[model samples]
Structure formats: C-alpha cells, structure tokens
Target: GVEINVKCSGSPQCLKPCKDAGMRFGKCMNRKCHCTPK
Candidate 1:
C-alpha cells in the first residue's frame, strides 16, 4: 500500500478521506492513511 499522507492514528478518520477519494477501504498505518481496493 501507498501512503496518502493524511494524518490519522485510526481507521475511522483515515477511512473518511479514502472513501471520499473513491477508495473501497482505508487504514491507518505508520501514522498515515492508506487506501485499499479489492
């Protein structure tokens, strides 16, 4: 996965940014937002 550079420590906050960008799923890892599709 690639970092989206969104500040987040959890999934809820990160997910919002991901979904808004049309990503299917999102996660917070390494204190950054990562988007996923599958």
Candidate 2:
C-alpha cells in the first residue's frame, strides 16, 4: 500500500527515510513533505 508521511520535509531531510521505506520524495504540501511509493 502507498502511504505518505507528513511530519518530514523533502530533499536531504526525509529523502533517506523515504528511500529506506521504498518511497521517493514526492513534493511539499503546505510546507510538509510527502513521500510516495515507487
């Protein structure tokens, strides 16, 4: 399933964690970063 975490930011912020979870840095939403599964 595809899930998004909103407590992190894109780029070097959550890129590693998101990558570890098989998710890419999607984009910034309302200032929060959203990670999406590949």
Candidate 3:
C-alpha cells in the first residue's frame, strides 16, 4: 500500500517522496501526489 498527500506539478517533487517511500515513482493526480509501483 502506498499513498502520499502533497502538492506537485507532475515533476520530481512528487517522485522524490514516492522514491523515499519505496515506490517506483509518483504522478500528479487530483492535484495531489500519487505514488505507484511496478
């Protein structure tokens, strides 16, 4: 399970947190940072 609530512009801003959380990467969704793994 992965979930992060933060502002991002579809850039590294979100990716960093995702990576930190052990996720593959992050994307901008609903104006919030969404993390995903593969």
Candidate 4:
C-alpha cells in the first residue's frame, strides 16, 4: 500500500487485511498505521 503524502485521521483498521498476509502492527506514522510485513 504505497500511499501517503501529508497526513490525516488515519484508519488503523485499514491495515487489518495485512494480517491475512502474515503481518502485524508496527506503529503509527503521521497517524497512519505503519504495518510491517513479515
């Protein structure tokens, strides 16, 4: 998900699907959930 520029009230849930690819939460960058893929 190469998407970003400025920032906004990010939706962390947007990264929920990442779990399907065997990943988990990393942290928040400018409010957006920075999902680190495994």
Top TM-score model: 1
Question: Candidate 4, overall lDDT?
Answer: 0.49
Q: In order, how many clashes per candidate?
A: 0, 0, 0, 0
Candidate 3: the clashing residue pairs are none
| 22: Cα error in model 1, Å | 1.4
Off by over 4 Å in 2: 1-3, 26-28
Q: For model 3, how does the per-residue alpha-carbon lDDT over 1-38 read when each residue is reduced to its tens digit? A: 15577767775788887888788867768777777876
Q: Candidates' TM-scores?
A: 0.73, 0.42, 0.62, 0.33
Model 2: per-residue Cα lDDT at residue 5? 52
lDDT of 4 at 22: 58
Assess each prediction's global lDDT (C-alpha) against the native.
Answer: 0.80, 0.56, 0.73, 0.49
TM-score of 2: 0.42
lDDT by residue for model 1 (1-38), tens: 35688679898999887888878788888899887865
Candidate 1: list runs displaced more than 4 Å.
none
TM match of model 3 to true structure: 0.62
1 or 3, greater by TM-score: 1
Ranking by lDDT: 1, 3, 2, 4
Better of 1 and 2 by TM-score: 1
